[PDB]
Write a protein that binds this ligand. Structure first.
Ligand code: WKV
Length: 460
């Protein structure tokens, strides 16, 4: 029975509006409704992994597991195994997998982050799950961010708190937050970004939605504008939105947007918005293709419509050679030549690099680089040809060309990371000096760049 080199992943996000679901929710798991939908011919084909994020979920974990498992069994005739479930208040994540994957899955982690302080601590935050699927690390974040059209900055703050403090994945990757720990990271939920148009335009917006003309609304979507200005979700992807705004509907129909201010809304307008979103970030040159992104039309118990996204995702096998794991393979080496870090920092410490990768027995610390002044004010840290030669556990190019090296640049004075990035080993050539590049981030914000050349030796 061969190990897969691809799997499909279903991501669901649904703000349930503290109401039980209707008896049938299969349209959600089938990616049927509005937007980029799944072909009817695929309906019986199970996804490998289903990840369900809910917000304002009134159900017990047991109640929801029973509905989800029975839904998937009805669709697929497959009884799914529960990988993980984690709830913070009314924010929940469920991970289900086909039974054939039970022994491919390991290192399961769950965590949550509560956002805000005093007033603003009590119902918003995020839950997450990570695990290994054979040689591939998968991370999943369901976040319910701050509501309200005039709080996009708070939402951006909530995002940074979640990515700093959510403790998922390999704890040995100590300089790296969740935006660097996974082959594939899926971040979804009620992110609560709004269409930023005047309140007086509510009926105009509704008109536009009825005509399925979203262009003039998407050009005011706060998540798209904030992402374009690098204020939030830097280096994440989102599929094009081709479905109607998923909020705020009158319950028990989809015919009406309920946008007017009410005591129940704290006298706030809720203009139709794409509150409910799925984004991802995968390591460079790893296969990931969005195959659906849309909303259901027939699940009407909430003032939100469910959102689905599906993905093809490249995975690798758990590789064993004569040598590694448990030793190095002297026929492999990774050389970093003529490298330099360009940092935005104004500080004047020396810096060193750490190289982290599952292709190494353990992380490698470099010598300190040489600081120079860049022409436009910047710090340039030169490493020359001084960088340690990295000794991979396995030299087989079928393994090594699929790997990645995480890089942290750290202050010698404080040992704190000033920037984190990732370099793919999926090179055009071996035994050949080739350009490499990564942006560097810290707390998910751009702090600089790392570039130079690499020379990869494999056994072939
Ligand atoms: C090692 O642990 C697991 C491996 C595979 C699957 Br599938 C699920 C688990 C644990 N999850 C639960 C609910 O026991």
């Amino acid at each position: 029975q061969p190990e897969p080199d691809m799997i499909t992943i279903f991501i669901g996000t649904w703000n349930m509006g503290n109401a039980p679901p209707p008896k049938k929710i299969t349209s959600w798991f089938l990616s049927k409704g509005q937007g980029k939908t799944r072909d009817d011919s695929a309906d019986y084909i199970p996804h490998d992994i289903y990840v369900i994020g809910t917000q304002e979920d009134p159900l017990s974990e047991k109640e929801w597991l029973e509905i989800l498992k029975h839904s998937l069994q009805e669709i697929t005739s497959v009884t799914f195994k529960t990988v993980a479930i984690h709830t913070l208040w009314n924010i929940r994540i469920v991970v289900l997998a086909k039974p054939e994957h039970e022994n491919r899955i390991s290192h399961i982690c769950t965590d949550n982050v509560k956002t805000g302080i005093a007033n603003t601590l009590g119902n918003k935050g995020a839950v997450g799950v990570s695990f290994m699927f054979n040689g591939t690390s998968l991370g999943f974040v369901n976040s319910h961010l701050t509501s309200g059209s005039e709080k996009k900055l708070r939402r951006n703050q909530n995002y940074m708190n979640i990515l700093r403090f959510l403790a998922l994945g390999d704890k040995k990757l100590s300089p790296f937050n969740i935006t660097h720990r996974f082959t594939h990271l899926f971040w979804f939920g009620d992110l609560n970004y709004r269409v930023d148009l005047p309140t007086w335009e509510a009926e105009t917006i509704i008109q536009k939605i009825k005509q399925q003309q979203y262009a003039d609304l998407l050009s005011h979507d706060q998540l798209l504008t904030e992402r374009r200005e690098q204020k939030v979700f830097l280096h994440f992807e989102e599929e094009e939105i081709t479905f109607a705004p998923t909020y705020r509907f009158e319950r028990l129909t989809r015919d009406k947007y309920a946008y007017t201010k009410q005591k129940a809304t704290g006298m706030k307008y809720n203009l139709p918005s794409w509150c409910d979103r799925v984004l991802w970030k995968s390591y460079p040159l790893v296969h990931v293709v969005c195959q659906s992104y849309g909303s259901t039309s027939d699940i009407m118990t909430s003032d939100h419509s469910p959102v689905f996204a599906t993905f093809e995702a490249g995975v690798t096998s758990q590789f064993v050679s004569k040598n590694g794991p448990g030793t190095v393979d002297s026929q492999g080496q990774i050389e970093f030549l003529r490298c330099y870090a360009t940092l935005k920092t104004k500080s004047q410490t020396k810096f060193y690099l750490e190289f982290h990768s599952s292709c190494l027995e353990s992380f490698v610390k470099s010598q300190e680089g040489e600081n120079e002044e860049g022409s436009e004010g910047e710090l340039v840290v030169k490493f020359g040809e001084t960088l340690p030669k990295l000794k991979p556990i396995i030299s087989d190019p079928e393994y090594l060309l699929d790997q990645h090296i995480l890089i942290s640049i750290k202050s010698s004075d404080s040992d704190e990371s000033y920037g984190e990035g990732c370099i793919a080993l999926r090179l055009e050539a071996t035994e050949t000096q080739l350009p490499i590049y990564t942006p560097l981030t810290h707390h998910g914000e751009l702090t600089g760049h790392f570039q130079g050349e690499i020379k990869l030796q494999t056994s072939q």
